[PDB]
Amino acid sequence: DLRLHLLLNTSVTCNDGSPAGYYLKESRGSRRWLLFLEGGWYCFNRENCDSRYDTMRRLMSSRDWPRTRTGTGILSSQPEENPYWWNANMVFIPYCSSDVWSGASSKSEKNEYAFMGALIIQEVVRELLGRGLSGAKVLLLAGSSAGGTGVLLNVDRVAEQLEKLGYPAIQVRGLADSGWFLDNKQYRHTDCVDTITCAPTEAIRRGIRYWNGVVPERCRRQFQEGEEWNCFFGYKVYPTLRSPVFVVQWLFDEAQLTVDNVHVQEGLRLYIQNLGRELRHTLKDVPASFAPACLSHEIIIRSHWTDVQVKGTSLPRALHCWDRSLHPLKGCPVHLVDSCPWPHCNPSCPT
């Protein structure tokens, strides 16, 4: 199992001021480190954060965290379940900041909650450097859903942080799972007046102000003050990133359809087919990517993540090919995007 460590710097906190932390497996044999970012939506004002604290408190507090966790999928240490990185050092960072891992604000007089997701990541990295990460050769920053978007926001900040601390030999990379969202046309429309009616662009715009959210500097320089919400969307922030990033995205992601107000007539058929085509287009020039034509959400820490295949290649294989490419390869591809246009036209889609 993975063992819990609460942060020694107790001023880096979850939403309610309790200390953040991380779960760690060690692997003295290995110089490879995997840091996984958990997902789970977000909140963007007092009222919907208060609701989250009553019925989703583990995503806002460490008071009730268990001592241990079992690694699954890419966090598993058994080769039978994890053909990719089963011998690596494993780290699971719980999502307890409700800020898509972007915040840098403390609980104070004027703030009922702390939003410190961006600071949680640097503090975990800092404390791991005394536990063997100083000798690493690859640091893979991974994440699912809101954690996948967090990879896109923080992967270059982790690189920068290690360069400034004097560790130029650690290769920082990113693996973003199910966090590649589109600010597309919704199937049905509502003005942003409450949680259920606010589109992602409007909700994130409010969240950034509420969290004191931070985005990558090169992306901020393009869109400039007040327009930082653009950098939460993968196809806009990805071209500004310098670290290598592998993008995993279902073509018909359930969270995307939810925020598009989709829950089949001709109008909805065309909408669903157009969504797959628009997602497929934004990945055209992403060299390392895995995008199956399925209706689902998340993959990389699911125990049966090895089942799905695109063009006959599994995700663990594609990630292995990505490793080899960073040392095209005969029979070991890294760009795998389905072209069939309906959910589950790939027979290997999860049931």
Ligand X SMILES: *[C@@H]1O[C@H](CO)[C@@H](O)[C@H](O)[C@H]1NC(C)=O
Ligand Y SMILES: COc1ccc(NC(=O)Nc2ccncc2)cc1
* Smaller CB separation from ligand X, 9 or 274: 9
Q: Which of 297, 314, 335, 338 is catalytic?
A: 297
Structure tokens at 226: 């007040």
Largest CA distance in the chain: 60
Residue 253 appears among annotated catalytic residues: yes
CB of 283 to ligand X, least distance (A): 35
Any contact of residue 259 with ligand Y (CB under 6 A)?
yes
**Is 189 part of the annotated catalytic residue set?**
no
Going by the DSSP 8-state scheme, the letter that residue 231 receives in this structure is G
Any idea which residue has 């995307």 for tokens?
256
Which amino acid is it at 239? P
Q: What's the CA gap between 56 and 40, in Å, rounded?
A: 9
Selecting among 253, 314, 335, 338, the annotated active-site residue is 253
Choose which of 255, 283, 291, 319 interacts with ligand Y (CB under 6 A).
Answer: 255
Near ligand Y by CB under 6 A: residue from 210, 233, 271, 305: 233
Angle at 148 between CA 72 and CA 168, to 5 degrees: 95
Candidate residues 11, 70, 111, 197; the one interacting with ligand X per rule CB under 6 A: 11
Q: What is the rounded distance in angstroms from the CA atom of residue 59 to the CA atom of residue 175?
A: 22
Q: Which residues inside 259-318 make contact with ligand X, applying CB under 6 A? A: none
Residue 9 interacts with ligand X (CB under 6 A): yes or no: yes
In whole angstroms, what is the distance from residue 57 CA to residue 108 CA?
Answer: 20
**CA 154 → CA 81, 101, 187, distances in Å?**
28, 8, 31
Sign, CA torsion 204/35/40/304:
positive
Q: Does 41 bind ligand Y (CB under 6 A)?
A: yes
The stretch near ligand X (CB under 6 A) out of 5-13, 76-84, 203-211, 307-315 is 5-13
- Residue (13 or 61) nearer to ligand X, CB: 13
Task: Write the binding mask 114 to 143 for ligand X: x where contact by CB under 6 A, - elsewhere.
Answer: -----x------------------------
Among positions 11, 258, 303, 348, the unique one binding ligand Y when judged by CB under 6 A: 258
16 classed as catalytic: no
Query: Which token pair is 292?
Result: 């199956």
Q: What angle do CA 34, 154, 61 make, to 5 degrees?
A: 80
Eight-state DSSP code of residue 243: S
Shortest CB 33 distance to ligand Y, Å: 25
Q: Which residues bind ligand X (CB under 6 A)?
A: 9, 11-12, 119
Q: Which residues bind ligand Y (CB under 6 A)?
A: 41, 100, 146, 149, 181, 200, 204, 232-233, 255, 258-259
* Catalytic residue list: 145, 253, 297
